[PDB]
Design a protein around this ligand. Sequence first.
Ligand SMILES: CC(C)(C)c1nc(-c2cccc(NS(=O)(=O)c3cc(F)ccc3F)c2F)c(-c2ccnc(CCS(C)(=O)=O)n2)s1
Length: 270
Amino acid sequence: GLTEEQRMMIRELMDAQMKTFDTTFSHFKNFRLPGVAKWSQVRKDLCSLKVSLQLRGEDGSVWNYKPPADSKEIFSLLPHMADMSTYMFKGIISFAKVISYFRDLPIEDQISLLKGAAFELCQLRFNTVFNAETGTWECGRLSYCLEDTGGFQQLLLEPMLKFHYMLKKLQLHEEEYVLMQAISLFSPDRPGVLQHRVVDQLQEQFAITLKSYIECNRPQPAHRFLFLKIMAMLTELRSINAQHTQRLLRIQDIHPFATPLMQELFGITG
Ligand SMILES: CC(C)(C)c1nc(-c2cccc(NS(=O)(=O)c3cc(F)ccc3F)c2F)c(-c2ccnc(CCS(C)(=O)=O)n2)s1
């Protein structure tokens, strides 16, 4: 059984998630769409996550976008992805700002923790709209469908994609997703945090709550070691976070595309 501090911790996380996660993406509107030496590495960076895009209209109409082969056609999806990222990041920032453990930290550590974890919280939220049968992220009227590559194996060669399939296969509850979000957010070892002991104590408590929730609610033999599998996924997710930071920075060096909010989050000055 969870203690009262633990049940309350979960309720506060769950409430923050309910208030700040637009699961139907109803408020993502007026976003950009693809028009009607270092460069070899940028080519490698871009052609590794090909998605077609689908856009269903309230009236029943469907728009469908198929991406181009690398033959600057590589950049055609970046403004849209920047708008989607920005929308998600806003959701993430709101999430952090309504959690009491987060509001109570000094404002500089708030900033440092948000810059450390925005990508990871974004991937965690996206996993809950990921469909592993069809290979697609179902974001309300938007859909992002993985392109036929190689097969599912070759898709699993990409770390973001292997992470999404492997995280989906664990069939987490909402509680577990939200606790994963808090553990990743309260990482005491992000560049520029000052209250590292406070943040470490909070993280330890989130982790223990999660282990206890699993121990109380998931007895079936398939859930043995579930807690440790989740912590290994968070470790993997930090690895992915760092690779993607460098990926983004390279692309940004060649082809400016980041929004003001992304510039802030990734430490770009102007
Ligand atoms: C599920 C789905 C399909 C919606 C995706 N989500 C993400 C995702 C997840 C978390 C954060 C960000 N944002 S981000 O960290 O700022 C960022 C980093 C970066 F390296 C490049 C652009 C960025 F915006 C994301 F974009 C995707 C992603 C990841 C990496 N690269 C690309 C380009 C794909 S493309 C143009 O088709 O080649 N897209 S795909």
